[PDB]
């Protein structure tokens, strides 16, 4: 499917057996989710954003189904204002960013 | 031009007679550029992101050329770590997310 940007590009995701809404975010290198129950060990890490930084829990090799497409990768969990799906997962479901043309 | 996401989706922009690099950002409602010299009046405003909020200058009806495509809209200027092109301008250049 193709998605226009007149509205936030939100998708439904299924992770850790739970269903959530998340933003397809081409501006994020990483995937960051609001605090939630994940299973396993994790490592501490710091990530920055427009207002500064936040500390998050880093989980590796997490399976996530993004709008019906499966992907496995790193998922960060922390005080982000919104669930964001970053490039580390966007590449796995083949998202491309197209625009304009002429040629 | 189709763009894959294995690397950051950076583009060259021209605004206020100056050339800059900026990130195409589907996760941003607004366009936010690092402190730069723009002409005209503005309004103080605050916006948030991961990490909290920052205060910015809100410039209206700014002409920007993004990768060779013209658009006019609101441009915020402030302490952002990277120049970001948000949806307010992405729609104007027919930007689509496909997968």
């Amino acid at each position: 499917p193709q998605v226009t940007l007149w509205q936030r590009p939100l998708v439904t995701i299924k992770i850790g057996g739970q269903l959530k809404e998340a933003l397809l975010d081409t501006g994020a290198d990483d995937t960051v989710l609001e605090e939630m129950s994940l299973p396993g060990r994790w490592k501490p890490k710091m990530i920055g954003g427009i207002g500064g930084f936040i500390k998050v829990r880093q989980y590796d090799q997490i399976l996530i189904e993004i709008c019906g497409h499966k992907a496995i990768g790193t998922v960060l969990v922390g005080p982000t204002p919104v669930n964001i799906i970053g490039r580390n997962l966007l590449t796995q479901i083949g998202a491309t960013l197209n625009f304009g043309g002429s040629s | 031009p189709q763009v894959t996401l294995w690397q950051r989706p950076l583009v060259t922009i021209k605004i206020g007679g100056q050339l800059k690099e900026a990130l195409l950002d589907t996760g941003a409602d607004d366009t936010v550029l690092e402190e730069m010299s723009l002409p005209g009046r503005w309004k103080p405003k605050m916006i948030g992101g991961i990490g909290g909020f920052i205060k910015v200058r809100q410039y209206d009806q700014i002409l920007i050329e993004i990768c060779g495509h013209k658009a006019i809209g609101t441009v915020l200027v402030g302490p952002t770590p990277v120049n970001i092109i948000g949806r307010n301008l992405l729609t104007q250049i027919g930007m689509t997310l496909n997968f």
């Binding site: 501006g27 954003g49 427009i50 982000t80 | 996760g27 941003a28 409602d29 948030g48 992101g49």
Partner: peptide, 6 residues
């Protein structure tokens, strides 16, 4: 709300 991350 303006969301890139690094």
């Amino acid at each position: 709300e303006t969301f890139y991350v690094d």
